[PDB]
Amino acid sequence: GHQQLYWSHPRKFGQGSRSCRVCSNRHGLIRKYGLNMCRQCFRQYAKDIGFIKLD
Amino acid sequence: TYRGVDLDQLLDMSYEQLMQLYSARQRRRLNRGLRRKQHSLLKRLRKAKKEAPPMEKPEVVKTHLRDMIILPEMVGSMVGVYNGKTFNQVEIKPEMIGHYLGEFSITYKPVKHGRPGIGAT
Amino acid sequence: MAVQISKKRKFVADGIFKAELNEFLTRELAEDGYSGVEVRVTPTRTEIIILATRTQNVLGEKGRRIRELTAVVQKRFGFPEGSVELYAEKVATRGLCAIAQAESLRYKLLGGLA
Amino acid sequence: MLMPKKNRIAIYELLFKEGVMVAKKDVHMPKHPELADKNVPNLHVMKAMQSLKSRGYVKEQFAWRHFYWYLTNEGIQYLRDYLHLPPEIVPATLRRSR
Amino acid sequence: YTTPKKNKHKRKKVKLAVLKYYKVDENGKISRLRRECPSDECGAGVFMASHFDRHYCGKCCLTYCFN
Amino acid sequence: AIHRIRITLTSRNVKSLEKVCADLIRGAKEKNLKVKGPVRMPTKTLRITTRKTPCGEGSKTWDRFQMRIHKRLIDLHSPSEIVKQITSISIEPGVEVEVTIADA
RNA sequence: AAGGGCACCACCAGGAGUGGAGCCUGCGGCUUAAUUUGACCAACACGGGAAACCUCACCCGGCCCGGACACGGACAGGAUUGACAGAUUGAUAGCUCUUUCUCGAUUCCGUGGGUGGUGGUGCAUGGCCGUUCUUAGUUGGUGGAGCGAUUUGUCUGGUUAAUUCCGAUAACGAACGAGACUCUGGCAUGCUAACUAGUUACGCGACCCCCGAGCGGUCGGCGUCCCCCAACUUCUUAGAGGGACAAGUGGCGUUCAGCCACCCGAGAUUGAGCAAUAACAGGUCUGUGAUGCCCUUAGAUGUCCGGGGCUGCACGCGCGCUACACUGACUGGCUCAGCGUGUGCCUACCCUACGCCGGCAGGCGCGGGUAACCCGUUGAACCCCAUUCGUGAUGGGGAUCGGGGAUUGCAAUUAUUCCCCAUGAACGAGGAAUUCCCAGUAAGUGCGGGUCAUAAGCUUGCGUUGAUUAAGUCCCUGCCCUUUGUACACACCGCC
Ligand SMILES: [Mg+2]
Ligand SMILES: [Mg+2]
C-alpha cells in the first residue's frame, strides 16, 4: 500500500520498538546502561566492551 | 434506563456530560480523542439508519474494530463484529451501552471435553 | 551537564564503539592481515591505530584505501570533521598474533590446501 | 525502483564528492541522516546503491547494522559521464592537495 | 491454499492516445476547454479534470464541485 | 588571573590512573603549585548477570560480568593563573579526563 | 565380586519443606481456524518466553516489491506513476470498478538470473553452552617388556581435598589438570589524601535546668576551601603496602611426607571465577548480514496492515506464593540496612525532593540530580513496645464474584495495573513418596536490578533476624584407585 498504511502502526514503545544493535534481534535485549545489545551478542563481545569476569 | 434517564434524553446527551454517566474506563476512553476510524464508523451507521426503510431494521455493517464502546445513538443498528474468522452480526439492545462491542462476538467456541488422548498417563 | 551523559553510559558507549570498530576492521581488512585495533582518544581529537601485517596492502594508491576507511569512520559515528586520524602499524612477530595466523589459515584453506 | 531523477542525481553527486558513503540498514527510516535538505528516503538510497553494486561500480561492506559502500574505479567514469563532468574533478579520496 | 476469492484483477490503464484536449479555430484562437488549477503547486500549465460533477487538479488535488 | 581548577581522571584500570595521579602531581610540585589532595571516589561496579547458554537448555548457569570504574579528583590551585601555565595533559589511551573550573 | 578412599545433586542425627487446600506459572491431554514451537539427573518460573498491537513465527483477510543485473519488446505521437469524488472495502488500501487529471524514462512485459524467509534439516555444520566431571585424572619423547594390540613410566606402602607429597622402583626426563593464580570478606587507631566523606574543637544560635551549677544537656540548626577564614583522618572512601606460614609449643607419625591438641593472633579451611584428555548423533539453523543442502519467492513460507490466538478447560504433572493461626491477627507508638538504579544515536520512554487538591489509587506547579553533590542520613521489613481479639473455619484465609473510582497506551473486552466498599470458599499441619542444607548456614524478613509505555507470585543479587543437629559412615543412591570374572564392546537399558 501507500505511505498511509505501510508503516502506520505505531512502534513508539513496546517490544517491537527495540532491536539488538548488532543482530537486530527482538528477544533478550539488555537495555541496562543503554547497552541495547542482544544477550548472545553481549556474551560474544563483553570482552571487547570490557565486561570481564571476576567472580 | 442506563443511569435513570431514558433513551430519548440519551440521544441528545452530548459527549461532555455523557462521560459523567459512563463508568471510569468509558469516561477515560471518551476523554481521549476518538480516532478517525471510529468517526467513520459512526457516520456509516448514521448513513445506514437514515437510509434504512421505516419500521424495518437497517442493513448489516461490518467492522474489525471491536474496541468501539457503544454509544446511545447507535441503538437498533445491524453491526457485524469480527471474531477472528467471520463477522458476527449483533443487535444493539438498550442495555448494552457501557459494554464494548467485542463482548458480543466470542473469540472461541466453548470446549466440549472429549476422551483424553495419550497424555496424563 | 544535561548535554553529556553519565560516566557509566559513556564508558558503555566507548566499549560499544570499540567493539563495532573492531568488527568493521575484521570484516574489511580480513585479506590484509588484520591483527587488532588500538584507539587513542583525547578531548582534542581521537587517534585510531590499526595493527596489521601488510601495511602497503591496506594502504591504497597514494593512501587511497586508508583515506576511504577514514572517511567511513568519519561518516558512520559522526565525529567532528578532521578530528580522527587512521594509522596503520606493522605488527612485530606476526607469528604471535592468533588473529593473523587464524586468518592466514582460513586463506590457506580457501586457496584449496589440505 | 520507482525513485525519481531529482534525488538520484543528488545521491550520485554525494557518492562522487567523496569516495564512500555510509548508510544504516533501516528500510523504514523516514530520512537518510546526511543530505538532510533533499528529504530522500533511506530505502531509495539503499536500493540505488544496491543497483550500483549489481552493476559493479561500488563494493559493499556490512557491519552490525550499516553498509559501507566503496566506490570503485569503474564508478569514477560512470558517475563522470552520468553527471556530464570533465575528467578533472575527482573524489576527495582520490586526490588530496595535489 | 485454495483461496475462496478469485485472484484480484489488477488495473490495466486505458492506453490513452495523444491528448489533444484543446482546439484553436479560424487560423488560431486559443480555447481552454479544460479547467485551470489555480494553486502555485499546480501552476497555470497543467489543466484540471473534467468530471461530470466536479473538477480535479492533478498536482494540487483540489476539488471544485459544481452543483 | 585568580583561577582555581578541578581535574578529574577516570578509567577501567587502576595502574594507569595511579601513575597519572602520581606523575601529574609530581610535575605540579616541580612546577611549584600547591595541590589539593587526590580524592579517590568510591568505585562504580557495573554488574551484568547473563545465562551462559544461548538457548536456555542446560543447568541454569549464569555468567556474571563486572566493570570497575574508578575516578580520581585532583584540584590544582595557584595564586596566579593556571591554564597558561600548564597545558600538557600527558594522557595515555584508556583513561578519560575532564578539566573544569570552580565556576563550572 | 573383593580391597581402599570419597559425596547432604547419598545416608545417618536433625532443620525447613514439597506432595494435602486456594492461587500464579510451565509442560501433557482436551477443544479450537489458530491455541506457533523447541526442550521430556542432564525438559516441565526453561528458551533470560511476565505475548492486548508489535513481539509472531498460528489462523482469518487486505496492500505493496522493498523481483537487482543482463537480453529482447514497449514507448516522449507517452515506458509508466500518483490521485478527488462515488460505489466497493473493516479501512480515508486509487485495492478494484465508473470518471477524468496528473509524474515522465526513474518504470512495464517476458526470458535467465537475483534476493529474502523465526521455512525445513542441530542425525550436515561453525560458534556457544550443558553433561560425562568439578571427580582427579590425562598425555608425549627416550628407554625396558611383549610377535602385537598394548604395558612400565602413571607404583607395595604412608599422607592429602587432590598420581597432593614422601618413599620404593625399568625406568628417566617431562607436560596439562589439581595446586599455584585473580576477585572477594575478615585485622590493620601503620602511610597518602580528602568542601561530591566525615570527626573533633571553637563561634553564633534555638530549647530545658535555671533553685545554681553552665567547660550542664540536645540539635542531620548555621559557620571556620567563602580563601586565610581551626585542626584531624579514628569513623567513610581507595591506593600503595603489611599481615598467616602448620610459623611457635605438646603428642602421634618410617619421626620423612604429614596428622591431632593448644598459646599468641583479626583470621589456624571466606566464598567464588578460570578450570585437563576424550566424548554425547545432548540443545540451539526461532541470536546473528554464522551457514551448507532442500522448499517458497508475486494469489509470497518475503514484507506491511486489521483482528483473533498464544491465557482458551471433564483432567494429570513441575517449580513457586499464600495460609491453616494466640510463638498469632489488627490498631497505634518506638526503632536499625546494603547491594544497586536514575533523562536515552535510532528511541518517544528517567530517579524524583518539596508545595497544593483528593479519602485512596492519582492529579495540579515549583525545583534537584548525567550523580559519594538530588532522591537519601535511602526514617525498609522482620523484630520491639502498648490496644483489642479468645480456640470458633473466629478479627486466621482472601480465593471466587458485584459495583464504583484512577493510571499507561492507538486501543484495557478474554477483566494491564492500582484503589475503595461489598462475599468470605477450601484449608484445622497434609498418605505412599520425595527435595535442599553444616555457621551468619537453613529458615523468617523485607529492598534493589533484569524483563517495564503499564507492570513480578519468576530470577539475579543485597541487606535484617537467626538457629537445632553433626565433625561420621558406606546402609541406599553414586564416584575414584587396585585386584578379579566375563560369552558385553550401540558396552547390563548388554548379550542370551
Ligand atoms: Mg477482621
Ligand atoms: Mg574363567
PDB file of N, CA and C (backbone and C1' of nucleotides) in Angstrom, chain G residues 22-42:
ATOM      1  P     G G  22      -7.685 -26.860  45.606  1.00  0.00           P
ATOM      2  O5'   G G  22      -7.618 -25.271  45.671  1.00  0.00           O
ATOM      3  C5'   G G  22      -8.742 -24.510  46.087  1.00  0.00           C
ATOM      4  C4'   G G  22      -8.388 -23.054  46.232  1.00  0.00           C
ATOM      5  C3'   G G  22      -7.633 -22.445  45.062  1.00  0.00           C
ATOM      6  O3'   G G  22      -8.485 -22.040  44.008  1.00  0.00           O
ATOM      7  C1'   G G  22      -6.515 -21.907  47.061  1.00  0.00           C
ATOM      8  P     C G  23      -8.014 -22.219  42.484  1.00  0.00           P
ATOM      9  O5'   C G  23      -6.952 -21.051  42.272  1.00  0.00           O
ATOM     10  C5'   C G  23      -7.325 -19.690  42.432  1.00  0.00           C
ATOM     11  C4'   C G  23      -6.118 -18.803  42.607  1.00  0.00           C
ATOM     12  C3'   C G  23      -5.103 -18.830  41.475  1.00  0.00           C
ATOM     13  O3'   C G  23      -5.465 -17.998  40.387  1.00  0.00           O
ATOM     14  C1'   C G  23      -3.979 -19.056  43.537  1.00  0.00           C
ATOM     15  P     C G  24      -4.946 -18.337  38.904  1.00  0.00           P
ATOM     16  O5'   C G  24      -3.390 -17.996  38.947  1.00  0.00           O
ATOM     17  C5'   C G  24      -2.943 -16.665  39.159  1.00  0.00           C
ATOM     18  C4'   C G  24      -1.440 -16.572  39.108  1.00  0.00           C
ATOM     19  C3'   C G  24      -0.778 -17.200  37.898  1.00  0.00           C
ATOM     20  O3'   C G  24      -0.823 -16.364  36.759  1.00  0.00           O
ATOM     21  C1'   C G  24       0.386 -17.834  39.854  1.00  0.00           C
ATOM     22  C1'   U G  25       3.372 -20.066  36.190  1.00  0.00           C
ATOM     23  C3'   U G  25       2.804 -19.226  34.063  1.00  0.00           C
ATOM     24  C4'   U G  25       2.857 -18.081  35.057  1.00  0.00           C
ATOM     25  O3'   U G  25       3.205 -18.851  32.759  1.00  0.00           O
ATOM     26  C5'   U G  25       1.694 -17.125  35.010  1.00  0.00           C
ATOM     27  O5'   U G  25       0.457 -17.809  35.137  1.00  0.00           O
ATOM     28  P     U G  25      -0.907 -17.004  35.290  1.00  0.00           P
ATOM     29  P     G G  26       2.649 -19.663  31.492  1.00  0.00           P
ATOM     30  O5'   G G  26       3.595 -20.941  31.420  1.00  0.00           O
ATOM     31  C5'   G G  26       5.006 -20.802  31.354  1.00  0.00           C
ATOM     32  C4'   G G  26       5.680 -22.146  31.407  1.00  0.00           C
ATOM     33  C3'   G G  26       5.064 -23.211  30.517  1.00  0.00           C
ATOM     34  O3'   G G  26       5.528 -23.124  29.183  1.00  0.00           O
ATOM     35  C1'   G G  26       5.399 -24.089  32.687  1.00  0.00           C
ATOM     36  P     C G  27       4.784 -23.932  28.015  1.00  0.00           P
ATOM     37  O5'   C G  27       5.348 -25.412  28.166  1.00  0.00           O
ATOM     38  C5'   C G  27       4.587 -26.517  27.716  1.00  0.00           C
ATOM     39  C4'   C G  27       5.058 -27.812  28.323  1.00  0.00           C
ATOM     40  C3'   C G  27       4.173 -29.006  28.024  1.00  0.00           C
ATOM     41  O3'   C G  27       4.415 -29.560  26.747  1.00  0.00           O
ATOM     42  C1'   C G  27       4.606 -28.940  30.333  1.00  0.00           C
ATOM     43  P     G G  28       3.281 -29.463  25.616  1.00  0.00           P
ATOM     44  O5'   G G  28       2.458 -30.810  25.808  1.00  0.00           O
ATOM     45  C5'   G G  28       3.141 -32.044  25.951  1.00  0.00           C
ATOM     46  C4'   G G  28       2.333 -33.040  26.738  1.00  0.00           C
ATOM     47  C3'   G G  28       0.941 -33.337  26.216  1.00  0.00           C
ATOM     48  O3'   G G  28       0.940 -34.222  25.112  1.00  0.00           O
ATOM     49  C1'   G G  28       0.855 -33.031  28.553  1.00  0.00           C
ATOM     50  P     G G  29      -0.047 -33.957  23.873  1.00  0.00           P
ATOM     51  O5'   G G  29      -1.495 -34.246  24.467  1.00  0.00           O
ATOM     52  C5'   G G  29      -1.855 -35.549  24.900  1.00  0.00           C
ATOM     53  C4'   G G  29      -3.110 -35.524  25.732  1.00  0.00           C
ATOM     54  C3'   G G  29      -4.330 -34.895  25.081  1.00  0.00           C
ATOM     55  O3'   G G  29      -5.004 -35.778  24.203  1.00  0.00           O
ATOM     56  C1'   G G  29      -4.077 -34.031  27.257  1.00  0.00           C
ATOM     57  P     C G  30      -5.665 -35.223  22.849  1.00  0.00           P
ATOM     58  O5'   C G  30      -6.957 -34.438  23.347  1.00  0.00           O
ATOM     59  C5'   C G  30      -7.976 -35.101  24.079  1.00  0.00           C
ATOM     60  C4'   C G  30      -8.994 -34.124  24.609  1.00  0.00           C
ATOM     61  C3'   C G  30      -9.546 -33.138  23.595  1.00  0.00           C
ATOM     62  O3'   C G  30     -10.562 -33.685  22.776  1.00  0.00           O
ATOM     63  C1'   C G  30      -8.909 -31.970  25.537  1.00  0.00           C
ATOM     64  P     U G  31     -10.575 -33.362  21.203  1.00  0.00           P
ATOM     65  O5'   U G  31     -11.146 -31.878  21.127  1.00  0.00           O
ATOM     66  C5'   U G  31     -12.435 -31.573  21.636  1.00  0.00           C
ATOM     67  C4'   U G  31     -12.627 -30.090  21.822  1.00  0.00           C
ATOM     68  C3'   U G  31     -12.362 -29.221  20.604  1.00  0.00           C
ATOM     69  O3'   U G  31     -13.434 -29.205  19.678  1.00  0.00           O
ATOM     70  C1'   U G  31     -11.296 -28.274  22.477  1.00  0.00           C
ATOM     71  P     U G  32     -13.131 -29.113  18.103  1.00  0.00           P
ATOM     72  O5'   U G  32     -12.482 -27.672  17.917  1.00  0.00           O
ATOM     73  C5'   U G  32     -13.232 -26.496  18.179  1.00  0.00           C
ATOM     74  C4'   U G  32     -12.366 -25.265  18.123  1.00  0.00           C
ATOM     75  C3'   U G  32     -11.704 -24.987  16.783  1.00  0.00           C
ATOM     76  O3'   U G  32     -12.576 -24.353  15.863  1.00  0.00           O
ATOM     77  C1'   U G  32     -10.111 -24.758  18.517  1.00  0.00           C
ATOM     78  P     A G  33     -12.815 -24.986  14.407  1.00  0.00           P
ATOM     79  O5'   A G  33     -11.816 -24.176  13.472  1.00  0.00           O
ATOM     80  C5'   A G  33     -11.201 -24.780  12.342  1.00  0.00           C
ATOM     81  C4'   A G  33      -9.981 -23.998  11.938  1.00  0.00           C
ATOM     82  C3'   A G  33      -8.932 -23.859  13.032  1.00  0.00           C
ATOM     83  O3'   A G  33      -7.980 -24.905  12.943  1.00  0.00           O
ATOM     84  C1'   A G  33      -9.460 -21.718  12.118  1.00  0.00           C
ATOM     85  P     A G  34      -7.456 -25.670  14.250  1.00  0.00           P
ATOM     86  O5'   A G  34      -6.339 -24.698  14.826  1.00  0.00           O
ATOM     87  C5'   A G  34      -5.300 -24.211  13.990  1.00  0.00           C
ATOM     88  C4'   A G  34      -4.654 -22.993  14.595  1.00  0.00           C
ATOM     89  C3'   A G  34      -4.489 -23.032  16.105  1.00  0.00           C
ATOM     90  O3'   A G  34      -3.319 -23.726  16.497  1.00  0.00           O
ATOM     91  C1'   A G  34      -5.438 -20.959  15.457  1.00  0.00           C
ATOM     92  P     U G  35      -3.350 -25.319  16.711  1.00  0.00           P
ATOM     93  O5'   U G  35      -2.404 -25.557  17.969  1.00  0.00           O
ATOM     94  C5'   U G  35      -2.839 -25.228  19.284  1.00  0.00           C
ATOM     95  C4'   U G  35      -2.700 -23.753  19.561  1.00  0.00           C
ATOM     96  C3'   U G  35      -2.147 -23.395  20.933  1.00  0.00           C
ATOM     97  O3'   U G  35      -1.439 -22.159  20.832  1.00  0.00           O
ATOM     98  C1'   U G  35      -4.305 -22.495  20.714  1.00  0.00           C
ATOM     99  P     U G  36       0.126 -22.152  20.467  1.00  0.00           P
ATOM    100  O5'   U G  36       0.199 -21.484  19.023  1.00  0.00           O
ATOM    101  C5'   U G  36      -0.029 -22.246  17.847  1.00  0.00           C
ATOM    102  C4'   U G  36       1.187 -22.277  16.959  1.00  0.00           C
ATOM    103  C3'   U G  36       2.281 -23.254  17.360  1.00  0.00           C
ATOM    104  O3'   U G  36       2.020 -24.574  16.910  1.00  0.00           O
ATOM    105  C1'   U G  36       3.235 -21.142  16.889  1.00  0.00           C
ATOM    106  C1'   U G  37       7.259 -24.209  18.570  1.00  0.00           C
ATOM    107  C3'   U G  37       6.916 -26.495  18.105  1.00  0.00           C
ATOM    108  C4'   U G  37       6.181 -25.655  17.072  1.00  0.00           C
ATOM    109  O3'   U G  37       7.416 -27.710  17.575  1.00  0.00           O
ATOM    110  C5'   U G  37       4.754 -26.051  16.803  1.00  0.00           C
ATOM    111  O5'   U G  37       3.942 -25.846  17.946  1.00  0.00           O
ATOM    112  P     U G  37       2.356 -25.850  17.831  1.00  0.00           P
ATOM    113  P     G G  38       7.656 -28.971  18.539  1.00  0.00           P
ATOM    114  O5'   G G  38       9.098 -28.710  19.162  1.00  0.00           O
ATOM    115  C5'   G G  38      10.227 -28.514  18.325  1.00  0.00           C
ATOM    116  C4'   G G  38      11.372 -27.890  19.080  1.00  0.00           C
ATOM    117  C3'   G G  38      11.884 -28.675  20.277  1.00  0.00           C
ATOM    118  O3'   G G  38      12.807 -29.679  19.894  1.00  0.00           O
ATOM    119  C1'   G G  38      11.611 -26.389  20.861  1.00  0.00           C
ATOM    120  P     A G  39      12.645 -31.185  20.424  1.00  0.00           P
ATOM    121  O5'   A G  39      13.149 -31.109  21.931  1.00  0.00           O
ATOM    122  C5'   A G  39      14.431 -30.588  22.244  1.00  0.00           C
ATOM    123  C4'   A G  39      14.504 -30.165  23.688  1.00  0.00           C
ATOM    124  C3'   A G  39      13.923 -31.151  24.687  1.00  0.00           C
ATOM    125  O3'   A G  39      14.823 -32.192  25.018  1.00  0.00           O
ATOM    126  C1'   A G  39      13.081 -28.998  25.141  1.00  0.00           C
ATOM    127  P     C G  40      14.405 -33.722  24.769  1.00  0.00           P
ATOM    128  O5'   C G  40      13.495 -34.078  26.025  1.00  0.00           O
ATOM    129  C5'   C G  40      14.035 -34.069  27.341  1.00  0.00           C
ATOM    130  C4'   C G  40      13.165 -34.829  28.314  1.00  0.00           C
ATOM    131  C3'   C G  40      12.705 -36.209  27.844  1.00  0.00           C
ATOM    132  O3'   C G  40      12.635 -37.087  28.965  1.00  0.00           O
ATOM    133  C1'   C G  40      10.822 -34.862  28.307  1.00  0.00           C
ATOM    134  P     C G  41      16.241 -33.832  33.465  1.00  0.00           P
ATOM    135  O5'   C G  41      17.394 -34.096  34.533  1.00  0.00           O
ATOM    136  C5'   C G  41      17.179 -33.817  35.909  1.00  0.00           C
ATOM    137  C4'   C G  41      18.263 -34.401  36.780  1.00  0.00           C
ATOM    138  C3'   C G  41      19.677 -33.921  36.505  1.00  0.00           C
ATOM    139  O3'   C G  41      19.951 -32.669  37.106  1.00  0.00           O
ATOM    140  C1'   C G  41      19.662 -36.279  36.762  1.00  0.00           C
ATOM    141  P     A G  42      20.866 -31.591  36.350  1.00  0.00           P
ATOM    142  O5'   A G  42      20.223 -31.499  34.899  1.00  0.00           O
ATOM    143  C5'   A G  42      20.802 -30.676  33.893  1.00  0.00           C
ATOM    144  C4'   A G  42      20.782 -31.344  32.539  1.00  0.00           C
ATOM    145  C3'   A G  42      19.510 -32.121  32.210  1.00  0.00           C
ATOM    146  O3'   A G  42      19.216 -31.995  30.818  1.00  0.00           O
ATOM    147  C1'   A G  42      21.375 -33.573  32.117  1.00  0.00           C
TER     148        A G  42
END
